[PDB]
Amino acid sequence: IVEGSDAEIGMSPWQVMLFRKSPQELLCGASLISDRWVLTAAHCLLYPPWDKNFTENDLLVRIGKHSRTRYERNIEKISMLEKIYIHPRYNWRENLDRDIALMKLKKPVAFSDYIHPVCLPDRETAASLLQAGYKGRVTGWGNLKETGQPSVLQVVNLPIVERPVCKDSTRIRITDNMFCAGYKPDEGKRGDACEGDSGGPFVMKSPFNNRWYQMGIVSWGEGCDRDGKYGFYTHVFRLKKWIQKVI
């Protein structure tokens, strides 16, 4: 996260760390959506153009965490993956269309003060919150500057951007399965996800029922926190039918 701040303890209890067993390193973010299901981006697990192809036994999930590196005993919970489900029409060849994956934990995780699932949006929620200029929240342990990791989980709040503005900031072909977020050069504030934050949640707090909803998945961007560029997020609601038949 660029231009963010430390998260508070318990601020993002759905945040999941996808940790590479060997070599020991942060692979991606993810989110907890049930006691046994974790949501992430498909390209965190599968990206042939960079020879990336991770199976269940390559990865560990670490849930409840705050420190990027310290074992948090009686706070964090480690888990192993039963099965990985990548969207059948995930387009790794071009633009990362349908950048979504689900992961089943080998055993369900007990919830706690630090571990708690995020909601997925309904149609009513998606319609009320997915409006240009409304701010979501992005969290992760990714890099603080373009291409230098934080001590603890970082947080930044970012506005959803009008679709024609998103499409005009990039040469990439943008699909209805993506939205973009970020401040514009003349907005005074800044902030972005960066390397390491991929697959984490873009969440919004409903003013109607006080609950946090995962509206997006950290998918891709051009640089980190560049003027005139914006982060692109998987449009979670539009893919809910696929999320459905997996569980």
Partner: peptide, 29 residues
């Protein structure tokens, strides 16, 4: 059923340091 309500914030009627910024962006003006 309990999703998205945080034990250390919503369940204790405590706001985090910046969730007001989010709510404030949802109002049009």
């Amino acid at each position: 059923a309990d999703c998205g309500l945080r034990p250390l914030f919503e369940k204790k009627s405590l706001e985090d340091k910046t969730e007001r910024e989010l709510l404030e962006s949802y109002i049009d003006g």
